[model samples]
Target chain A: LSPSFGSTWSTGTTNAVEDSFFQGITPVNGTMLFQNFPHHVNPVFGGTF
Target chain B: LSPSFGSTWSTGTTNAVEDSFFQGITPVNGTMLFQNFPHHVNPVFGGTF
Candidate 1:
């Protein structure tokens, strides 16, 4: 399925840089990691290291 | 910063399919759209269409 309001990315050898307006939130100096699944999605604040 | 857990992907022309175990949640058939910014990340349930 597709999203009604948002963007999607690929879990490969690349990274993305979005804007605060699109996210609908205040800008915060932080990083979030995500994992895509067949059913749901997972996300975490900070690096997985 | 990097994520302490989970995985990350690039917002390009690719998709990912992770597992329930890694997400630490029950499996549910759904899709998540994401957008990354210089400060934080944004995610939505479904596609932007």
Candidate 2:
């Protein structure tokens, strides 16, 4: 993931904790996961390899 | 790019790929790749992406 992980986010937190944590985040569209995912505890929750 | 693809990833899996085509990951604020890459893939390495 990018070191400036949250650097490119337009509107959101940069922590994945709050985004993919599965609590406040429900299954939604790009707005929540993409547009707003930057607001998460980690901004970049890409899949594993 | 945001699609709840890994919505259920717990703290660990959400943090590790288990294998890595490469290995375990480390890099603290530097979590998973951007999936959003050209979004780039630094640190460990995988995908098999």
Candidate 3:
């Protein structure tokens, strides 16, 4: 396979500055915009939440 | 049932945290130091990094 193109906070929302590329993401305006998304998680970064 | 053993940053260096184990850690240090760790990350918690 090949690598993917990632979007940066270069010109997106300023709130993105306070977010982690993994947690505060969607299909646009963030580092997770262009990858194979719909990422899976255990109900947040940890199971306690 | 041997969950495993982990080390602590109680008095050790930090860069080795990843190389450390998850023993019955103390009421100190951080969370990454107390169980069958060596966690499964979605690539640095996600492909962001």
Among the numbered candidates, top TM-score falls to 2
Looking at model 3, the pairs that clash are B5-B22, B5-B23, B6-B21, B6-B22, B6-B23
**What are the per-residue Cα lDDT tens digits for candidate 2 across A1-49?**
3221121122332333332322222333233222222222222444444
Evaluate candidate 3 and give its CAPRI docking class based on DockQ: incorrect
lDDT of 2 by residue, B1-49 (tens): 3322222223334332221221112323322343332233334334533
- Give the whole-model CA lDDT for all candidates, comma-separated: 0.34, 0.29, 0.26
lDDT (Cα, tens digit) per residue for candidate 3, span A1-49:
3333333323211211111222111123222122222335242332222
Best-to-worst lDDT order: 1, 2, 3
After superposition, the stretches of candidate 3 with alpha carbons farther than 4 Å from their true spots are: A7-9, A17-19, A23-49, B1-49
lDDT value, residue B26 of candidate 1 = 25
Residues B1-49 of candidate 3 have per-residue lDDT tens digits of 2232223123322232332222232233222212232234343222221
DockQ of each candidate relative to the true complex: 0.05, 0.04, 0.02
Reference interface contacts recovered per candidate: 0.05, 0.02, 0.00
What global local distance difference test value does model 2 have? 0.29
Q: How accurate is candidate 1 locally (lDDT)?
A: 0.34
Assess the local accuracy of residue B3 in candidate 3 as a C-alpha lDDT between 0 and 100: 30
Model 1: runs farther than 4 Å from truth? A1-23, A39-49, B1-49
RMSD of 3: 20.9
1 or 3, which is superior by DockQ? 1
Candidate 1 vs 3: which has more TM-score? 1
Give one digit per residue, the lDDT tens place, for model 1 in B1-49. Answer: 3223333446434322222212222233454445333334354444442
lDDT minimum window of 10 residues, candidate 2 chain B = B16-25
